[PDB]
Every structure is written in structure tokens, then in C-alpha cells.
Amino acid sequence: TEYKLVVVGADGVGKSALTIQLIQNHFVDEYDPTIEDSYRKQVVIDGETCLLDILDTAGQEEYSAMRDQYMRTGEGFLCVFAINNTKSFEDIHHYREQIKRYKDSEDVPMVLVGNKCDLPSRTVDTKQAQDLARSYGIPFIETSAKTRQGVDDAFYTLVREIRKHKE
Ligand SMILES: Nc1nc2c(ncn2[C@@H]2O[C@H](COP(=O)(O)OP(=O)(O)O)[C@@H](O)[C@H]2O)c(=O)[nH]1
Ligand SMILES: [Mg+2]
């Protein structure tokens, strides 16, 4: 089993910090906001040895075979906003709508991620995000790429969402 995961969201929410934290177990001070790269790691999720294939999107809006491939053939999607960034949360609808267009489905496995929960500058409330994920029928996970809180949980929950879609 090998799960193909796509990390989407507005620029600056921490998509690249979340990915590097999962794969490389550390918080990167700086990561080129224009770099869009694919990352694989073997992990054990719920006693299940599997390989994760993660595309860290940059939102280049350019001709990419790999990115249009991961959007089409990617089986799960992390929808990431920042809890200190109201706009990125208002942006979540555009990203979910775009995913449903690439997959031809209502029920694509997805997770809503609220990153940077270590910050006190909170503009998006837990209930506000919980109440949106409720409408989509997807899970909501609170993360911080800096402290690693919820990083494994977010990525592993998405895999578990993928598992219930095969059944
Ligand atoms: N405090 C805090 N800062 C974060 C977190 N995640 C990302 N950042 C910062 O947010 C900025 C943008 O993050 P980045 O991963 O490049 O976002 P991307 O554009 O979506 O790829 C960087 O300066 C990071 O240091 C977090 O969980 N907590
Ligand atoms: Mg990035």
C-alpha cells in the first residue's frame, strides 16, 4: 500500500513546513515559497507499514505534468489554512471546489488543517473551523509545524480517510 497525498492551501499557511516536519522531523526556518516538490517516506500508521507520496504545492499556476497528475490521481488532500490568517480560511472553499473538479467526486478523502496553532494571534476559532469541516463531512485537525503538534495526526487521519474510501 502506497498513499498519494497532496498538500493544498493558500501561500504562507505552512504547507511546506508541515511536509518537511513529517518527512524530515524538523522545522525549517526558510523554505522557498515557490518550490513545489514531491516527497516520499515509509511510515507505520496504525501498525500498517506504508509509503506516503506527498506533493507540497506552491500554487505556481503553470504547466506541470506532475502537479496536474497529483491533483488528478492523488487519493487524499490536506486542506491547510493558518489560524492567524482569516483569508486563508476563507480560501478553503476554493481549494475544496478545485479538488472536487479534478477527482469527479463528492466524496474525496480530505482533511481540513488549521496550522500555526502555537501562535496567540488567533483569528479563526476552533468551532468556526470545526463547524466548516462538519459541513464537508471531513475531519479537522489542529496543527503546528513548529512544535510538531498534530503533524502526524493530520497526515495519518488523511490516510485513515483514504482507507474508508476503498471500502
Ligand atoms: N509559528 C509558526 N510558524 C509557522 C508554522 N508553519 C509555518 N510557519 C511559518 O510560516 C511561514 C510560511 O510557511 P511555509 O511552510 O513556507 O508556507 P507555504 O507557503 O504554504 O509553503 C514561514 O516563515 C514559517 O516559518 C507554525 O506551525 N507555527
Ligand atoms: Mg511552500
Side-chain angles (χ1 to χ4, degrees), residues 22-57:
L22 180 80
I23 68 185
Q24 295 180 181
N25 278 318
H26 61 99
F27 180 60
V28 291
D29 53 356
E30 189 78 20
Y31 198 98
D32 190 348
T34 78
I35 295 172
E36 183 175 2
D37 209 338
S38 167
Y39 294 109
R40 273 158 294 224
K41 193 198 207 328
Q42 183 178 78
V43 301
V44 177
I45 305 167
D46 312 327
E48 182 67 24
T49 318
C50 56
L51 192 81
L52 296 191
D53 193 3
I54 299 168
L55 180 82
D56 169 32
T57 63

Side-chain angles (χ1 to χ4, degrees), residues 33 64 133:
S64 296

Side-chain angles (χ1 to χ4, degrees), residues 22-59 64-147:
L22 180 80
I23 68 185
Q24 295 180 181
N25 278 318
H26 61 99
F27 180 60
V28 291
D29 53 356
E30 189 78 20
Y31 198 98
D32 190 348
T34 78
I35 295 172
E36 183 175 2
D37 209 338
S38 167
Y39 294 109
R40 273 158 294 224
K41 193 198 207 328
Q42 183 178 78
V43 301
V44 177
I45 305 167
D46 312 327
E48 182 67 24
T49 318
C50 56
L51 192 81
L52 296 191
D53 193 3
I54 299 168
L55 180 82
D56 169 32
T57 63
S64 296
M66 155 196 275
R67 175 196 196 120
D68 276 330
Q69 195 196 351
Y70 272 86
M71 281 303 249
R72 75 175 212 263
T73 198
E75 75 197 313
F77 300 83
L78 278 192
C79 283
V80 184
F81 69 99
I83 62 168
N84 72 331
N85 183 358
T86 289
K87 191 174 164 63
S88 71
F89 177 81
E90 304 172 340
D91 287 352
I92 283 301
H93 191 267
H94 181 259
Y95 295 108
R96 181 176 173 86
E97 292 305 319
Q98 191 179 5
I99 292 155
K100 274 187 296 189
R101 294 202 287 275
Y102 269 83
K103 301 291 305 163
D104 279 337
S105 179
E106 193 189 20
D107 207 2
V108 181
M110 273 186 225
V111 172
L112 178 61
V113 168
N115 195 36
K116 311 193 188 194
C117 74
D118 55 286
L119 288 173
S121 174
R122 191 175 203 185
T123 49
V124 180
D125 193 63
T126 300
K127 279 73 175 176
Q128 193 173 177
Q130 283 173 347
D131 193 352
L132 174 62
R134 207 185 290 131
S135 311
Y136 295 157
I138 63 173
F140 163 64
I141 293 89
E142 300 84 3
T143 66
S144 168
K146 197 182 163 263
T147 68

